[PDB]
Amino acid sequence: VKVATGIDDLSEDATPEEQQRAKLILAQDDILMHGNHEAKFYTLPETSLDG
Amino acid sequence: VKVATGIDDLSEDATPEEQQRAKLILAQDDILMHGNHEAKFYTLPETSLDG
Amino acid sequence: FIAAHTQDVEILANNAQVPVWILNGQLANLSADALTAATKGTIQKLYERQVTFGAAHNQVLRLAAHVEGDTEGARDFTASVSWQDTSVRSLAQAVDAYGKA
Amino acid sequence: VKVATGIDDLSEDATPEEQQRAKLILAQDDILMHGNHEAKFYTLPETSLDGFIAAHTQDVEILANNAQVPVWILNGQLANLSADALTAATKGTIQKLYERQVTFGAAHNQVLRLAAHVEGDTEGARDFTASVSWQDTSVRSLAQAVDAYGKA
Amino acid sequence: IELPDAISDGEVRKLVENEFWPEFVRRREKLDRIAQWARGEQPDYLIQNANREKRALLKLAKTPWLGLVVTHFTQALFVDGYRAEGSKENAKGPWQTWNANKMQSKQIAIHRAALTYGYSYARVLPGVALDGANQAEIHGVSPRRLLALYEDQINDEYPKYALELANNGKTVRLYTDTDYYELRMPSPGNFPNEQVIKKVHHGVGVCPFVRYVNMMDLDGFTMGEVEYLVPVASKIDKTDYDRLLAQHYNSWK
Amino acid sequence: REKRALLKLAKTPWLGLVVTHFTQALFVDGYRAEGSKENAKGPWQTWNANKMQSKQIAIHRAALTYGYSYARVLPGVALDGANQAEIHGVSPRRLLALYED
Amino acid sequence: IELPDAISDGEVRKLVENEFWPEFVRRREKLDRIAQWARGEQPDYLIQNAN
Amino acid sequence: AGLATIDELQTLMSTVFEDDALEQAQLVLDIVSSWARVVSGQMWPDAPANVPDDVRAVVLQASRRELKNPDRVISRQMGPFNVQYSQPPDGFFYPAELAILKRFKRSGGLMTVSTSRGEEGRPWAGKTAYIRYGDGL
Numbered sequence: 001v002k003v004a005t006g007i008d009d010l011s012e013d014a015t016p017e018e019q020q021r022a023k024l025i026l027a028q029d030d031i032l033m034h035g036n037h038e039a040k041f042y043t044l045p046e047t048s049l050d051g
Numbered sequence: 052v053k054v055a056t057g058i059d060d061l062s063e064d065a066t067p068e069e070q071q072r073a074k075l076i077l078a079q080d081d082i083l084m085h086g087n088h089e090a091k092f093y094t095l096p097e098t099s100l101d102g
Numbered sequence: 103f104i105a106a107h108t109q110d111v112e113i114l115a116n117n118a119q120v121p122v123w124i125l126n127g128q129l130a131n132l133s134a135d136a137l138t139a140a141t142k143g144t145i146q147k148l149y150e151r152q153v154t155f156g157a158a159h160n161q162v163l164r165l166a167a168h169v170e171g172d173t174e175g176a177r178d179f180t181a182s183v184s185w186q187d188t189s190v191r192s193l194a195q196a197v198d199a200y201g202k203a
Numbered sequence: 204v205k206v207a208t209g210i211d212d213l214s215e216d217a218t219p220e221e222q223q224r225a226k227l228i229l230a231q232d233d234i235l236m237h238g239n240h241e242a243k244f245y246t247l248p249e250t251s252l253d254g255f256i257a258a259h260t261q262d263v264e265i266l267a268n269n270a271q272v273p274v275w276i277l278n279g280q281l282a283n284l285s286a287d288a289l290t291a292a293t294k295g296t297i298q299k300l301y302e303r304q305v306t307f308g309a310a311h312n313q314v315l316r317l318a319a320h321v322e323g324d325t326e327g328a329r330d331f332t333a334s335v336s337w338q339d340t341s342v343r344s345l346a347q348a349v350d351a352y353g354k355a
Numbered sequence: 356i357e358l359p360d361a362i363s364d365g366e367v368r369k370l371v372e373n374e375f376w377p378e379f380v381r382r383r384e385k386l387d388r389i390a391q392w393a394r395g396e397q398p399d400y401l402i403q404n405a406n407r408e409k410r411a412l413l414k415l416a417k418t419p420w421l422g423l424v425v426t427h428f429t430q431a432l433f434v435d436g437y438r439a440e441g442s443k444e445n446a447k448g449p450w451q452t453w454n455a456n457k458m459q460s461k462q463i464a465i466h467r468a469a470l471t472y473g474y475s476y477a478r479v480l481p482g483v484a485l486d487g488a489n490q491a492e493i494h495g496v497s498p499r500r501l502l503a504l505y506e507d508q509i510n511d512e513y514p515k516y517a518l519e520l521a522n523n524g525k526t527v528r529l530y531t532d533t534d535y536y537e538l539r540m541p542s543p544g545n546f547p548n549e550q551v552i553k554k555v556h557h558g559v560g561v562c563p564f565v566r567y568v569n570m571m572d573l574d575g576f577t578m579g580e581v582e583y584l585v586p587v588a589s590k591i592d593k594t595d596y597d598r599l600l601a602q603h604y605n606s607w608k
Numbered sequence: 609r610e611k612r613a614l615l616k617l618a619k620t621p622w623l624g625l626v627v628t629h630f631t632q633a634l635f636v637d638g639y640r641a642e643g644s645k646e647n648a649k650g651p652w653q654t655w656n657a658n659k660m661q662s663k664q665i666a667i668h669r670a671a672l673t674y675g676y677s678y679a680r681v682l683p684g685v686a687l688d689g690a691n692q693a694e695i696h697g698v699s700p701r702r703l704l705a706l707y708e709d
Numbered sequence: 710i711e712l713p714d715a716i717s718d719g720e721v722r723k724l725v726e727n728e729f730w731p732e733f734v735r736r737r738e739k740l741d742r743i744a745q746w747a748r749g750e751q752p753d754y755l756i757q758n759a760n
Numbered sequence: 761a762g763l764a765t766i767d768e769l770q771t772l773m774s775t776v777f778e779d780d781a782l783e784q785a786q787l788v789l790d791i792v793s794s795w796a797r798v799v800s801g802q803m804w805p806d807a808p809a810n811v812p813d814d815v816r817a818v819v820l821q822a823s824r825r826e827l828k829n830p831d832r833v834i835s836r837q838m839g840p841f842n843v844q845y846s847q848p849p850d851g852f853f854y855p856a857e858l859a860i861l862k863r864f865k866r867s868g869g870l871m872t873v874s875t876s877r878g879e880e881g882r883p884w885a886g887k888t889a890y891i892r893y894g895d896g897l
Contacts, residue, residue, distance in 0.1 A: 001077065001081075002081075002082040005088055009084075009869075009871070010801070024873055024875050026877070036088075040088075051098075051101060055868070058868045059863075059865060062862065062863050062868045062869060063866065075870060076874075078600075079600045080604045082872060083870060083872050085870055085871070086869065086871075103258075103598035104261050107594045110591045111420075114584065114591060117584055117620060117622075117625055126268060128292075129288055130282070131288050132285075137291055140291075141291060147428075151428065154571055154662055156434075158477070159462075161565045165563065166449065167449055169479060169559055170452070170491050171489060172448045179659075180440035181439040182437075183437050186435045190287075191290065192286035192347070193286075194347045197354050198351070198354060201354050249608065255602070268423070269418060271423075298427075299426075302429070305460055309457060329485055331455060400616060401613050407883065408876065409881075411755055414754060509666075510696050520895060522895070571665040571666040571669070572666055573670045573698065583624075586618075586620065736891055740889070743889045746889070752882070754885050754886070756879060
């Protein structure tokens with residue numbers, strides 16, 4: 001699970017209905033960026049499923 | 052177990068009954084976010100079950 | 103995910119009484135006895151289906167004989183259809199066994 | 204991906220066109236250097252690509268099993284199998300070929316009966332017992348087949 | 356669904372339009388669901404509409420496993436002869452009837468229907484061959500086009516009444532012990548009173564349909580290889596869908 | 609309704625597989641007297657005339673599933689006359705048999 | 710798509726132009742799709758044009 | 761449409777706003793109400809009617825802070841009188857007040873953004889080349 005902290009909250013202007021999900025394009029070539037230097041991006045590990 | 056600390060508590064307005072579980076959509080494409088930069092997201096490991 | 107898919111397809115093959123290598127994986131090198139044991143369930147299921155469908159086929163053929171006269175054929179419930187062999191055995195082993203027999 | 208941070212920006216004097224790519228020479232002998240002591244050089248890891256290979260192998264195995272085609276025809280290699288194991292492994296493909304032979308043989312017999320009826324041949328047209336003969340589709344070695352048929 | 360003791364020539368239309376056809380449609384809906392399951396369209400236990408990007412992934416992960424099982428069990432069932440007790444030769448009459456009807460290929464369809472829907476039918480009606488004499492015609496009937504009614508499902512060899520839908524869908528035939536009535540059906544469920552119910556006396560003596568049961572059960576459960584293994588195939592499809600989503604969204608750094 | 613669908617996905621007919629596996633192996637091929645290689649004419653003709661080759665499968669399935677099963681032998685007449693009993697397998701769910709012991 | 714009992718020498722043109730040819734084209738489109746699938750042009754369940 | 765009425769502000773500050781002091785106070789109240797609406801994410805249609813008590817309290821405290829200390833000083837000396845104030849808030853609300861205003865957010869403030877790869881997706885592909893053979897239902 002990709003996790004972002006320290007991002008600019010209060011965005012999307014009181015997040016509405018009627019689509020409004022721009023669905024930020026994150027492909028193999030895209031580089032995800034944030035202006036704030038205090039922001040942190042990391043992922044949460046997953047279950048092995050072998051047991 | 053996904054663990055969140057430092058999040059905005061006191062939310063859900065005195066958490067009610069009659070559903071009220073919006074069931075935050077966390078799929079493979081969603082990026083979990085929090086505005087507070089002091090928030091920490093991590094997971095607790097699980098038992099191996101091989102023994 | 104790959105391991106889970108392999109396990110699920112194995113479950114499906116075992117529940118359908120279909121050999122595992124038909125659905126997933128590969129057949130390891132098995133001798134004649136091991137091969138006979140591994141395909142015994144599928145062969146027995148095929149034999150049960152043969153019994154049921156052969157009863158139905160004999161009913162069909164007796165009815166057909168009754169339609170075209172053939173009084174002897176209509177009442178001949180002892181006669182039965184013959185199914186082709188469903189055993190999975192090599193030609194050499196089968197021929198050697200039947201020649202020895 | 205080689206990554207540099209803290210370097211002197213604003214360089215190349217408003218980076219132009221017309222080549223201007225000096226293409227800094229970084230060979231096996233070169234030592235990359237920066238005057239600033241706050242600059243950091245590091246690399247971003249890359250994808251393993253092994254999971255993709257395993258997934259592709261699994262998908263091609265699924266396709267081979269669903270088409271009743273032998274697995275080694277589509278992916279992988281055939282392990283050393285004895286006569287019985289080989290017969291069991293190719294039983295599905297042979298049975299599918301036999302079903303296709305039955306249907307296409309019914310169609311071929313219909314075609315040949317119609318052809319006989321066209322050219323007279325009253326006996327051939329009404330001979331529904333006659334059937335076409337297909338060549339062997341069994342995957343067996345020459346030695347085993349000859350030994351078995353000679354013993355028979 | 357009580358079976359009348361005898362159907363009169365004037366009660367055929369009312370019985371077909373009121374009692375038989377609604378039951379036939381009720382069974383046909385479920386049989387169509389079973390048929391589409393066997394063609395790779397396994398049921399979706401988890402639907403996530405209004406994405407169109409994960410829906411394509413879900414359609415990518417659907418694999419016809421049940422159709423593979425049915426095909427595998429069909430390819431091994433073949434009848435090569437019909438011999439009497441203690442005889443090495445095929446019976447002339449029955450085997451000539453089997454060959455004249457091209458049953459070598461139609462047995463494949465009969466077996467497929469029986470393995471898919473749990474049961475299947477074959478219709479034996481009187482006919483005449485090219486040389487004359489008497490040659491019955493055997494036609495396999497799909498369960499989705501026949502509604503056979505038995506006074507005792509477990510222990511009966513022939514039905515009491517059978518409602519048959521034509522392979523073109525234009526006519527509906529109701530079969531009895533000695534006669535069958537043909538009705539013109541322009542629209543599904545529409546039987547105009549202007550049409551005259553054609554009556555044909557086949558004279559077989561019983562209902563000319565013979566049922567091919569996939570599984571013998573004392574409780575009457577006609578179980579097919581498809582609906583018996585739906586959860587496992589759907590589980591495999593869901594696992595494949597999860598893997599597809601993982602490699603579509605979380606496969607690169 | 610989202611974990612319930614998962615639970616319905618995880619259910620697999622293992623017990624049905626066990627019963628089917630044990631049913632496909634139990635088949636009767638003849639009824640012979642003591643010290644005789646030939647089938648008894650009367651009992652075996654009765655067995656064949658009742659199509660017991662297929663109904664034994666249902667009887668065995670019922671016995672392996674519910675722990676017991678019944679077969680009803682009532683008088684009847686064959687196509688040629690004389691006397692031919694009819695044997696019909698009865699499910700435990702449709703018969704309540706009471707024994708003094 | 711009802712089949713006439715017999716086609717007259719004058720009804721051939723009308724039948725072909727009205728009933729038979731449109732059905733032939735309807736089947737031909739699907740058959741052409743199947744044919745191009747068999748030549749390596751499998752359907753694209755996910756299209757990402759303009760790259 | 762301030763979230764708290766000027767009468768409540770006058771009662772809290774124990775003062776009466778007259779002439780230009782009233783328009784400035786009303787403007788400050790409206791400004792703080794806009795901040796509170798944006799932070800909480802709840803656009804209250806009837807600003808003084810259905811506004812919660814704690815939201816009114818937060819608005820009143822922020823308005824009093826802005827009116828009494830608009831320039832955000834730390835200390836202030838005039839002759840023998842000296843006053844030393846605490847550190848002013850980042851905007852209008854202290855972290856506790858920001859937490860109170862954010863209590864109307866769902867799932868404890870956790871928000872998710874859905875990503876995509878730009879692929880349109882055609883689930884109907886593969887079913888296009890399909891011809892109906894049979895009765896037709």
